[PDB]
């Protein structure tokens, strides 16, 4: 006896959570862009030490 | 206490001081390390040392003449000093050995001997002078791929492939009358220097120096030079600041004076009226720091440098310092502004009224090359006393609040955290 109400509250819940999932992917890739393009160089020192 | 400029095709500036015991005369050019390219970087540092080599300093010493020179990013200098009644001999030496004849100075033996010494100077700098090489690295990450990135001493790799032809080419392009100022400081009168010049004719070259394709641009970035065998960590951090000939020139200098400079081992430096010191001294997170506001023709930098032996609490040092900066937008008081006013006046009052005429000549020539005129010290004081709290908050809200940063560091910097945790401290999130 909850069939009609249940299917309408699930439309609200699935729309909200689907957009939060796409927004979370955007925000992550922005805050991770420094680490992904960081670069390293090596110059062998003198083994005096 | 007033400077006098005339023009004949040759600009001649002078700050006469009758109560001095020496006189300095020289020529300043308006090209520096920010007027060369990555291939010929250091050609100006090699021009300075050809001027100061032995057989040219010997010829001056027999006449009673001392020599000096300086390389910067916007200008170069070649100065001669003497006793007050010997200034016409100073001008002759500057005429003969420098502007007209230089085949004597660019010989094959003097060039190799000079290159050997300069390479040893630069190699020594890069292995032992840690606070100054980190500030040079800051300039190179902030202004990367622009002319304001190149180091003033040159780089050990570019300095090895220079020949005499590189010197002669650079001279023909930049040592020109249109790009030159003749200066005179100490016990020297303006009319006598003008008369001595027109008795000769005294012109170097005509003009038309090259225009620089790219303009300077700031970029937020970092460069880390990790060395675990050194006993400290050296760090410098800045934002984009004000250039010369800006309306906010003195307001940025006052803001740097609010946080000031510190030495942990001096007793009186621990008692300064700076609220940042209430946070560092309880666990002693640093040995020293200093706040700067550097200004050039195209851009500037505003920030601080520090050295520390407490390598496990670096993140507390950077955090507490950046939170104090936030207060310039939100809660700076009137007492902090009235203190920085009078200490800024004492600072630049000692820079512009020292006793050395050599420093006077470098300052005068660099200012007249940009503005065409020198602002007196009585005028600069009136601009400083007219600054209010509102001017500071308006400047900081535009230059500091949630803005990108540049960072450089060397030594034991494991405890220096990533870029974005430091960038996030530029806004408070409690306002």
Three-state SS string over B139-176 comes to: HHHHCCCCHHHCCCCCCCCCCCCCCHHHHHHHHHHHCC
Question: The dihedral of CA B395, B399, B400, B403: what is its sign?
Answer: positive
Reference B298, options B349, B245, B334, B351; nearest CA is B245
The string of DSSP codes covering B201-225 is --------PPPPSSPP----EEEEE
Does B127 contact A at CB distance below 8 Å?
Answer: no
Interface test with A, best of B126, B220, B406, B420 (most A CBs within 10 A): B420
Q: Is B90 exposed, middle or buried (0-12, 13-18, 19+ CB in 10 A)?
A: buried
Task: With beta carbons under 8 A apart, name residues in chain B contacting A34.
Answer: 418-420
Largest CA distance in chain B: 70
HSE, side-chain direction, 13 A CA sphere, residue B89: 15
**Nominal resolution in Å?**
2.4
Reference B71, options B118, B25, B116, B4; nearest CA is B118
Reference B118, options B159, B152, B158; nearest CA is B159
CA distance linking residue B383 with residue B403, whole number of Å: 27
| Domains observed in chain B | 1-202 (3.30.830.10), 208-431 (3.30.830.10)
Tally of structural domains, chain A:
1
Which approach determined this entry? cryo-EM
- Percentage helix, strand, coil for chain B under 3-state DSSP, each rounded to 5: 45, 15, 40
User: Does the beta-carbon distance from A34 to B229 stay under 8 Å?
Assistant: no
The string of DSSP codes covering chain A is --HHHHHHHHHHHHHHHHHHHHHHHHHHHHHTHHHHH---------TT-
User: Does the beta-carbon distance from B418 to A34 stay under 8 Å?
Assistant: yes
Task: With beta carbons under 8 A apart, name residues in chain A contacting B420.
Answer: 31, 34
CA distance linking residue B204 with residue B172, whole number of Å: 10
Task: With beta carbons under 8 A apart, name residues in chain B contacting A35.
Answer: 418
Q: Nearest-CA residue of chain B relative to A48?
A: B229
- Residues in Cβ contact with B140 at an 8 Å cutoff, skipping those fewer than 6 apart: B149, B150, B151, B223
Give, in order, the Cα–Cα distances in Å from B12 to each of B65, B134, B177, B179: 21, 38, 11, 13
Task: Report the CATH number that the domain containing residue A13 is assigned in CATH.
Answer: 1.20.5.100
Question: How close, in Å, is residue A39 to chain B by CA atoms?
Answer: 10
CA distance linking residue B141 with residue B408, whole number of Å: 8
Place of tokens 């300077």: B216
Give, in order, the Cα–Cα distances in Å from B38 to each of B34, B135, B172, B355: 10, 19, 19, 38
CA distance linking residue B133 with residue B246, whole number of Å: 28
What is the distance between the terminal CA atoms of chain B, rounded to a whole angstrom? 48
Question: How close, in Å, is residue A2 to chain B by CA atoms?
Answer: 45
Q: B357 with B24: CB under 8 angstroms?
A: yes
Domain region containing A18 = 2-46
Joined tokens for residue B269: 């430096």
CA distance linking residue B303 with residue B291, whole number of Å: 6
């Amino acid at each position: 006896p909850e069939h009609d109400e249940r299917k309408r509250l699930g439309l609200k819940t699935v729309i909200i959570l689907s957009s939060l999932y796409l927004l979370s992917i955007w925000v992550k890739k922005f805050k991770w862009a420094g680490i992904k393009t960081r670069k390293f160089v090596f110059n062998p020192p003198k083994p005096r030490k | 206490a007033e400077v006098t400029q005339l023009s004949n095709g040759i600009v001649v500036a002078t700050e006469h001081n009758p109560s001095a015991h020496t006189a300095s005369v020289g020529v300043v050019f308006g090209s520096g390390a920010a007027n060369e390219n990555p291939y010929n970087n250091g050609v100006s540092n090699l021009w300075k040392n050809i001027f100061l080599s032995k057989e040219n300093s010997a010829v001056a010493a027999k006449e009673g003449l001392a020599l000096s020179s300086n390389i910067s990013r916007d200008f170069q200098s070649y100065i001669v000093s003497s006793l007050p009644g010997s200034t016409d001999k100073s001008l002759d030496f500057l005429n003969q050995s420098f502007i007209q004849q230089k085949a004597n100075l660019l010989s094959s033996s003097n060039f190799e001997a000079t290159k050997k010494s300069v390479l040893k100077q630069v190699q020594d700098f890069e292995e032992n002078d840690h606070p100054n090489r980190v500030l040079e690295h800051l300039h190179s990450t902030a202004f990367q791929n622009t002319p304001l990135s190149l180091p003033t001493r040159g780089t050990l790799e570019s300095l090895e492939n220079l020949v005499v032809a590189d010197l002669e080419s650079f001279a023909n392009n930049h040592f020109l009358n249109s790009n030159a100022v003749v200066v005179g400081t100490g016990n020297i009168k303006h009319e006598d220097l003008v008369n001595s010049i027109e008795s000769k004719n005294l012109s170097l070259q005509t003009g038309t120096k090259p225009v620089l394709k790219k303009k300077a641009a700031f970029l937020g970035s970092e460069v880390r030079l990790r060395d675990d065998t050194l006993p400290k960590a050296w760090i410098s951090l800045a934002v984009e600041g004000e250039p010369v000939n800006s309306p906010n020139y003195f307001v940025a200098k006052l803001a740097a004076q609010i946080f000031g400079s510190y030495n942990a081992f001096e007793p009186a430096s621990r008692l300064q009226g700076i609220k940042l010191l209430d946070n560092i001294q309880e666990y002693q997170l640093c040995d020293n720091f200093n706040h700067f506001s550097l200004s050039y023709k195209d851009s500037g930098l505003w920030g601080f440098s520090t050295a520390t032996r407490n390598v496990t609490m670096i993140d507390d040092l950077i955090h507490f310092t950046l939170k104090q900066w936030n207060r310039l937008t939100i809660s700076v008081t009137d007492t902090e502004v009235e203190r920085a006013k009078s200490l800024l006046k004492l600072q630049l009052g000692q820079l512009y009224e020292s006793g050395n005429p050599v420093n006077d000549a470098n300052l005068l020539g660099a200012e007249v090359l940009i503005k065409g005129s020198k602002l007196s010290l009585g005028e600069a004081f009136k601009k400083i006393d007219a600054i209010t709290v509102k001017d500071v908050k308006a400047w900081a809200g535009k230059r500091l609040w949630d803005q990108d940063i540049a960072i450089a560091g060397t030594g034991q910097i494991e405890g220096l955290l990533d870029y974005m945790r430091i960038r996030s401290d530029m806004s408070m999130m409690r306002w």
